[PDB]
Design a protein around this ligand. Structure first.
Ligand code: NAG
Ligand code: NAG
Ligand code: NAG
Ligand code: NAG
Ligand code: NAG
Lengths: 365, 374
């Protein structure tokens, strides 16, 4: 079993904090002196990439592949997802990611972020929504949209859906909101990226739709990065979802060290709030370390030019069989690398209103 | 000066045998014209077959064409390869000309030969005054139709029971969905699936029995002529279909007359299967490419030259523009493009089969919307 396990790191635009979290989590692993928790050194090589270009994506993947890595941690968007994950799959290198999960049956991808659709549909039912507005972008795929369409008639949901991910002129958001008001819509499900959600909620406040009698359900696990204070102060209801629990001691002990890091070596640790994707980045290193510790205890042989490895299968299986407690709670996977047996906490405005899991569905406090 | 030979790439996938025959045949038809105004340069190609839509296969095939030096690439993508392939083309300013499913997305360097279907579907749903209906779909052609239905449903009073069926392996699951839909009193189905999948669904309709008379199946796929619907039609179903090839069009007739006489060994699938609309689009792709390059020559445009360093080719933008500005008459009717390489000013013909008989019911275009024949 090698003394050093090397992993790749594939970072994109807008992942600076996660890159700091990645370096910090690797440091936390390596500086443990308990040699049962640290029986090998963890090394990485980072590449930064532009997703919109196959050349940059393929180049970064190939740079890691030729270097010899036992797994790749990284990020994708809609443009790069298939490129990156299909490369990993073809070469049997496991990709561990905090990026949006897929519905698709895919191999060699460990999807750290749990699916949100179940929790959304349970809360729509719990609140007895019938008429509602569905504002969405497609940057996290179509899983939520499809689940709503499958269930709508059977739940009597009358969904006015508006695709908003291509809107550049904020006046277009304003006209949609105005149109929805003339149809007496009070309830909005917003399935967008955090930055987009913030833009939409500012338009809500500008138009005065942030009073009592309106309800915004924000379908994004990035709840703590949403600027919703101004909406809350007007009296409208807000519902949100999180997978990081501030009362979890692992979260508390990470945060206490994290906020004290040097801003020069760890940008965005000290000023910016911790993104849930940075928590998932920490949790990715936990999963990788556990899998490789498992392989070593079982005496599995891990061994080790991209365009011109059956130890890959063993690594993938070891990754998917982990059961660990992380900043994002209980971490386990199914055979497609999807989180299973996870919990989503549900927030109302600023308190925790209940929780959601796959077996109990939504349980209100 | 303008080169005596223009070379294009060809990127072919699994299950594109007929289209590959149509590509070679259309290149032959271009090259064997003796009128030197219609043929001022030789058209050459280099073909790669993509053993998979995984990135390894796709990157190798793209890089092989790029190093060969091609002035444009004709080819195919699926959901797995679309972004990989089109982004490679886009980064190098090489235009990709394709009969594959179009996208909603604003992309550059992609000439999308296949017209969008969503407009015609929504017009026919309105024309028939459907309110309650079943939407059975797969995602192999993207989400454009699904999103358009969802955007319009409340304003049109559509009560749409959507079922995603593209992952079904066991045909009994199709039977269970139908039985579930019967519990909801459903008679009207919009089926937005690949042809093979549509044929499986309609076989289950026939095996069940009692799902023809009183039912209406709107088949949202331009591959109408490959759909096996005879047994459904004989039981009294209504069927609505869509096509972009008119067999009475003289360009189609003169192509077909030669096509069906080609040698089966050099041109597999020309004699033993009807012409797939994607094969017609493949022919039309070569028409578009020839016209664009004839135009570039007349304008004295510099077309000189043609992986993994990104350095776009300077001449690429001019080639793309020439491609997108064409206005030509093809097997798929009038061919024009918008700035994103989407077909514009195209016609979709609408077919109805009912127990009284079978006919062309009308046509659809963006400006006239749905026009019924008498
Ligand atoms: C806001 O929440 C309250 C209970 O907290 C609920 O009764 C009310 O209906 C909600 N508003 C809307 C528009 O649904
Ligand atoms: C789910 O997770 C809990 C830990 O929170 C564990 O005790 C339980 O056994 C797990 N259930 C499974 C694997 O089905
Ligand atoms: C050759 O084709 C051109 C372009 O359509 C046409 O205008 C011309 O009349 C043809 N010439 C002959 C000799 O047939
Ligand atoms: C079948 O077509 C006839 C018109 O020819 C129409 O009246 C009927 O509604 C259609 N059937 C269904 C189930 O829509
Ligand atoms: C649309 O196509 C027809 C031929 O089908 C052509 O006569 C007409 O000029 C075109 N219209 C536009 C707006 O380009």
């Amino acid at each position: 079993f090698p003394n050093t396990i090397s992993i790749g790191g594939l970072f994109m635009r807008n992942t600076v904090q996660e890159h700091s979290a990645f370096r910090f989590a690797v440091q936390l692993y390596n500086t443990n002196q308990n040699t049962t928790e640290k029986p090998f050194h963890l090394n990485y090589h980072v590449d930064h990439l532009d997703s919109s270009n196959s050349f940059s994506v393929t180049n970064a993947f190939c740079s890691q592949f030729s270097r010899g890595v036992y797994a790749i941690f990284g990020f994708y968007d809609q443009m790069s997802m298939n490129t990156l994950t299909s490369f990993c799959g073809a070469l049997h290198t496991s990709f561990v990611t905090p990026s949006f999960p897929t519905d698709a049956d895919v191999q060699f991808v460990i999807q750290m972020r749990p699916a949100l659709k179940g929790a959304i549909l349970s809360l729509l039912s719990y609140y007895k929504w019938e008429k509602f507005v569905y504002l969405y972008d497609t940057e996290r795929g179509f899983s939520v949209l499809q689940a709503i369409m499958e269930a709508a008639v059977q739940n009597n949901w009358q969904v006015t859906a508006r695709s908003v991910g291509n809107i550049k002129d904020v006046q277009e958001f304003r006209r949609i909101i105005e149109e929805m008001d003339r149809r007496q819509e009070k309830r909005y499900l917003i399935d967008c990226e955090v930055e987009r959600i913030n833009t939409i909620l500012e338009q809500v406040v500008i138009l005065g739709k942030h009073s009592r009698g309106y309800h915004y359900m924000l379908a994004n696990l990035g709840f703590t990065d949403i600027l919703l204070e101004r909406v809350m102060h007007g009296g409208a209801n807000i519902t949100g979802f999180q997978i990081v629990n501030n009362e979890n001691p692992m979260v508390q002990q990470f945060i206490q060290r994290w906020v004290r890091l040097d801003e020069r070596e760890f940008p965005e640790a000290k000023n910016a709030p911790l993104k849930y994707t940075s928590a998932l980045t920490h949790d990715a290193i936990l999963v990788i370390a556990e899998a490789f510790r498992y392989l070593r205890r079982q005496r599995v042989d891990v061994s080790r030019d991209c365009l011109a490895w059956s130890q890959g299968i063993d690594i993938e299986r070891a990754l998917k069989m982990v059961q660990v407690q992380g900043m994002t709670g209980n971490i386990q996977f199914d055979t497609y690398g999807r989180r299973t047996n996870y919990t989503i906490d549900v927030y109302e405005m600023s308190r925790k209103a209940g929780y959601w899991n796959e077996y109990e569905r939504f349980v209100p406090f």
